[PDB]
Swiss-Prot record:
Glycyl lysine isopeptide (Lys-Gly) (interchain with G-Cter in ubiquitin) crosslink residues: 61, 68
The organism's place on the tree of life at top rank: Eukaryota
The protein's assembly and partners: Interacts with UBE2B; promotes the UBE2B-H2A interaction and the ubiquitination of histone H2A by UBE2B and UBR2. Interacts with RECQL4. Interacts with TEX19; does not lead to TEX19 degradation and stabilizes it. Interacts with CASP8. Interacts with ATXN3. Interacts with UBE2O.
Chain positions recorded as a peptide binding sites: 51, 53, 56
Role noted for this protein: E3 ubiquitin-protein ligase which is a component of the N-end rule pathway. Recognizes and binds to proteins bearing specific N-terminal residues (N-degrons) that are destabilizing according to the N-end rule, leading to their ubiquitination and subsequent degradation. Recognizes both type-1 and type-2 N-degrons, containing positively charged amino acids (Arg, Lys and His) and bulky and hydrophobic amino acids, respectively. Does not ubiquitinate proteins that are acetylated at the N-terminus. In contrast, it strongly binds methylated N-degrons.
Domain notes: The RING-H2 zinc finger is an atypical RING finger with a His ligand in place of the fourth Cys of the classical motif. The UBR-type zinc finger forms a pocket that mediates recognition of type 1 N-degrons. It exhibits preference for arginine in the first position, and a lower preference for lysine and histidine. It binds N-degrons with a methylated arginine or lysine in the first position.
Annotated binding of Zn(2+) 3, by residue: 30, 54, 66, 69
Name the record gives this protein: E3 ubiquitin-protein ligase UBR2
Name of the gene: UBR2
Family membership noted in the UniProt record: Belongs to the E3 ubiquitin-protein ligase UBR1-like family.
ZnF region ranges: UBR-type: 1-70
Residues where Zn(2+) 1 binds: 2, 27, 30, 52
Amino acid sequence: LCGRVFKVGEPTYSCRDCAVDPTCVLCMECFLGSIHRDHRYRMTTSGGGGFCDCGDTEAWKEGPYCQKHE
Ligand SMILES: [Zn+2]
Ligand SMILES: [Zn+2]
Ligand SMILES: [Zn+2]
């Protein structure tokens, strides 16, 4: 699993099509290797803290894993 903890200023990505709720997010590496880069995504700059949800089926209605972690 990715598990990346976001640092100050780091971009986080959600998918408006696949996220189960708005707290479901991916780090940049997982987002760019995921199906969601072709979807309606939303980038929010992190203030630090929280973690990447790559791999969590309860976080994503489709495409829970990126190509690196699948
Ligand atoms: Zn990640
Ligand atoms: Zn990943
Ligand atoms: Zn998506």
